[PDB]
Amino acid sequence: CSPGIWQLDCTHLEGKVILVAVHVASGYIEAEVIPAETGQETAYFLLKLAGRWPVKTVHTDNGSNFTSTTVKAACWWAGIKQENPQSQGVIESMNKELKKIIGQVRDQAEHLKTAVQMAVFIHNHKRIGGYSAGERIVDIIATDIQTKELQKQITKIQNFRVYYRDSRDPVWKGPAKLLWKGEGAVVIQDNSDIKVVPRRKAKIIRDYGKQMA
Amino acid sequence: CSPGIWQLDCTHLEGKVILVAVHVASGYIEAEVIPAETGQETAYFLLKLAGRWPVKTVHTDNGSNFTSTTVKAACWWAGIKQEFQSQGVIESMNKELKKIIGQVRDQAEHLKTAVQMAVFIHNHKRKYSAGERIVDIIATDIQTKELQKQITKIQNFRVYYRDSRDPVWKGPAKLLWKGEGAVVIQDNSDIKVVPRRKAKIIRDYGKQM
Amino acid sequence: CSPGIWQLDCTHLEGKVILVAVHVASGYIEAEVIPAETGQETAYFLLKLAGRWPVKTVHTDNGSNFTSTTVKAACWWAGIKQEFQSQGVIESMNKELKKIIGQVRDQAEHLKTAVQMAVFIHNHKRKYSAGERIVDIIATDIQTKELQKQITKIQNFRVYYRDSRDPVWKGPAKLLWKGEGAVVIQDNSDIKVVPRRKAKIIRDYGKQM
Amino acid sequence: CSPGIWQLDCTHLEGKVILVAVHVASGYIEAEVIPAETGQETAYFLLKLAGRWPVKTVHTDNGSNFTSTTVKAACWWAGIKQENPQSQGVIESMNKELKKIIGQVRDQAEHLKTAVQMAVFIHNHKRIGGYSAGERIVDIIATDIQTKELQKQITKIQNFRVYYRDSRDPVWKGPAKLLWKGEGAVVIQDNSDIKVVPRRKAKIIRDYGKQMA
Lengths: 213, 209, 209, 213
Ligand SMILES: Cc1c(-c2c([C@H](OC(C)(C)C)C(=O)O)n(C)c(=O)c3ccccc23)cc(F)c2c1CCCO2
Ligand SMILES: Cc1c(-c2c([C@H](OC(C)(C)C)C(=O)O)n(C)c(=O)c3ccccc23)cc(F)c2c1CCCO2
Ligand SMILES: Cc1c(-c2c([C@H](OC(C)(C)C)C(=O)O)n(C)c(=O)c3ccccc23)cc(F)c2c1CCCO2
Ligand SMILES: Cc1c(-c2c([C@H](OC(C)(C)C)C(=O)O)n(C)c(=O)c3ccccc23)cc(F)c2c1CCCO2
Prior knowledge:
The structure is a homotetramer.
Chain A: E1 6-12, E2 17-23, E3 30-33, H1 39-52, E4 57-59, H2 69-78, E5 81-82, H3 85-104, H4 112-125, H5 133-159, E6 161-163, E7 178-182, E8 185-189, E9 194-197, E10 203-205
Parallel strand pairs in A: 1-4, 4-5
Antiparallel strand pairs in A: 1-2, 2-3, 6-10, 7-8, 8-9
The complex binds ligand 2SQ (4 copies).
One ligand 2SQ sits between chains C (40, 43-44, 47, 69-70, 73-74, 77) and D (109-111, 114, 118).
C-alpha cells in the first residue's frame, strides 16, 4: 500500500532532464541522469527501481512518458501498477531540496551527473529525531516484511474451521475460526465472543481438500 | 563483519559491458550496464551504489579496475576502503545471473533490459529466501549500533561499590544494569549486585573530544 | 608532551601533612594542607586541582598513595591516567619550598599559612621567569589544538589534480593551502601547486561517527 | 584593573557555608568547603587565591569577615586591595548557577563538598562562542601579561629625551620622547607631530643618571 508507493519526477537541468525516484514515506530517493529524457530512458530506471524494492503504485502528475506504452508495459513486468495533502506537499519540495543540495557540490563536481548522485548520497545519509530517510526505508520495509508473512500466516489460520464441545453436555453451535493452537489448547471466536478450549473437547478441520499444493 | 560488505566483479558479456554489485549475505545485486568500461565509468554507478547501501569495503579480483585513480576517488568519498570458494559462489552468482538473463533474453531486444530483469529474478526470488533480502539484516544492524552504543555507554561508566559489611571499598566494576533499588555489575571474573547506598556511579567523564 | 603534565609528591613536614602540585614546565604549585593523610584526602584537593589545570597524567614516587581506590577514582572523573634528575628537580622544588616556608615561618603562627605564602613566593617569582607561569604556555596550547584541528582538517581532505599538459590525473595529495586562483599540495616526496581548473577538492567524507 | 578583579561570595548549604571565588571576566571560579565559615577560614582561601593569580581588588557587598582584620591583613600580604550593571548582574547569578549544577551530581556524591568541586570542574570545563570561562582566564591573563611587560617597555621608552637636527640648517625646538629606535633610525613626536630621523641627525640622551639600578 502506502509502503509500496514511490514518487517519481523529472526536472530539467542544463537542458538535460534529471530522473527522480522518491520513496513516499522513507523518502529514500534514487535519481539517475540520462543524456536525453525519454519514455524509453524512463523504463530503464524503473526496472532497476522495482529491483531495488517492490512498489505497488508510483506517481507522476501528468503522463508524457508514463502514458507511453513502453513505460506502462514495464510496470506490468514488475507488476507495479501506475498510480493526503501532507504527502502531496513533500514531493514538489523533495524535488526542490536536492537541487539546493546539488548546487553546493556543483563546484565540487566536473560532471553535473557526477554531482547529483553525490547530492543523493547525502540526502539518504543526512539526519533528535530519525536515523535519516534512507535508514527509514530499510525499517519501514522491514516491518512490512514481517507483516506480509504474518498476514499470510493469518490467512492460513483463517481457512480452518473449529468444532467445539464447550460444556460436555450442551448442544453444538455453528463453527468458528481458530486464532491459535497449543497442545490441548485452541483459541477461537464463535461470533464475537472469544473462548479457549482443550483438544479432546474440540476437533480442528482442514479447510481445503483439492488444494493444488 | 559480512554486513555492509559488497562484492563487484568484472563481467565479460556479449556486446556492451556491465558490472554487478554483490552484498554477500543477501547475495543482492544492483548491476548497471555501461557502453564504455573503465573503473571510472564503474565509479559513477558505485557512487549510486553506496547510497542505497553504505558499504564498508569491497574485494576485487582485478587490481586494474581498482587501480584507476578515479576508482579509489570513489572509495574515499564513500570512505570506502578497498578490501584489497566464496568468490566462486559470487562467481556462481554471476553465472546464475548469466543463465537468468538468457532465460528472459528472448523477451527483450536490448541486452540491458534483460540484465535488469535478470537482476529482478535473483531479487525477490523465493527459496527463508535471498529475495526477502538483507533489509532485515540492515535493520538489525541499524538496531545494532545503538545497542553497541548503549552497552558502550554502560562500558564507559565506572561504578564504585562497597561489599556489604566491608569498610574496604570495591574497585570500579563494569555495570550490567541500573536499578533504583539495586544496580548489577562485574569487576572481572566475579559479578555482584548491590543496593544504591552500598555503591556510587559517577555521572560522566570527558574523553573522545 | 610536558604541557598538561603535573607532578605531586609526598611531603614529610613538621606537624600537619600537606602535598604540593607541580606543573613541570612552569614549576607552578598549588599545595594544600591536610590534617589527615590518605591518597583519598589527597583526592579532594586533586579534584580541585584539575579544574584550574586540566592535567593529562601524574607520575607518583609512591604506589601506595596512588593505590587507594579513591585516588584512582579521582583519576577517572578527571579521565586522568596515572603516569605510572627531573624528579630530583621536583624534589629540589619541594626543598626550595621547604626553605621558603622557613624564611617566612616566623611571620605566621600557623604552618599552613606559611606554606601558602611559600607557594606564593615560588609563584610570581621574578627570575624570563617561573612566576609569570605557564599561562602563556596554556594559551599557546589553547591556540594549539585548533591549529592541530585545522591542519588535521586539511589533512582529512583529499585533493585530485591533473599535471598541466597531462591527461593522466595525479593521485590525491595533502593540500598545503587553498587559493581561489590556486591551491598548494604535496602528494608525498614532491609538492606542486595548480590552478582550480587543473584539480578538484572533494567537499567532505564521513568518518569518526 | 578589571582583569585583576575577582568576585568572592559565601552562601549557606546544609547549614555549612560555601566559599566562592568568581573571576570577574573569565568567570573561572574557585570555591572551597570549610567545616565552619569564619573570617579565619576566609583568609586561608585568599592566600591560595592570590597564589593562583594576582587580583588588584576583590568584591563582597557586605563585610562580616572582610572587615575582620585577619582578612584585611591577608589582603595586604598579597597586596590585593579589597574593593557596570551587567558585571553586577552576573555575580548573584554566578552563585545561583553552581547550586543548580551542584544538585545534579549531589546524588552523585557522598559528601556535599566532594560534589561542589566537581560542580566547579564542570563549570570551568563547560562550553559557537567561547572555549568556556576557564579557558578564558588563561587567555585574558595572557594578553594582560604581554601588556604589562609592554607597558613597562613603554615606560622605559618614555623616559629618554630626543635631540633632533630636522633640516641641517634650522634652529632647534624643544625635545620629544622617542617611540622607536632603528640603526640610523629614530621615531619621536615633537608635540603631536610625528617624524622619523637619521642617527647622525639626532642624539638620544639617557633620562636618568643616579638611578638605583
Ligand atoms: C519489452 C520491454 C520493453 C521494451 C523494449 C525493451 O528495451 C528497453 C530498453 C526499452 C527496456 C526490450 O529490450 O525489449 N523495447 C526495445 C521496445 O522496443 C519496446 C517497445 C514497446 C514496449 C516496450 C519495449 C520495455 C520495458 F521497460 C520492459 C520490457 C519488458 C519487461 C518489462 O519492461
Ligand atoms: C570527482 C570524482 C571523480 C572524477 C571525475 C568525476 O567524473 C566522473 C564522470 C569520472 C565520475 C567528476 O565529475 O569530476 N572526473 C571527471 C575526473 O576527471 C576525475 C579525475 C581523477 C580522479 C577522479 C575524477 C571520480 C570519482 F570516482 C569520484 C569523484 C567524486 C566523488 C568520489 O568519486
Ligand atoms: C566519589 C569519589 C570518591 C569517593 C568518596 C567521596 O568522598 C571523598 C571525601 C573521599 C572525596 C564521595 O563523596 O563519595 N567517598 C566518600 C568514598 O567513600 C569513596 C569510596 C571508594 C572510592 C571513592 C570514594 C573519591 C574520589 F577520589 C572521587 C570521587 C568522585 C569524583 C572522582 O574522584
Ligand atoms: C599573619 C597572617 C594571618 C593571621 C594569622 C595566621 O594564620 C591564619 C590561619 C589566620 C592565616 C598566622 O599564621 O599568623 N593568625 C594565626 C592570626 O592569629 C592572625 C590574627 C590577626 C590577623 C592575622 C592573623 C592571616 C593571614 F591571612 C595572613 C597573615 C600574614 C600573611 C598574609 O595573610
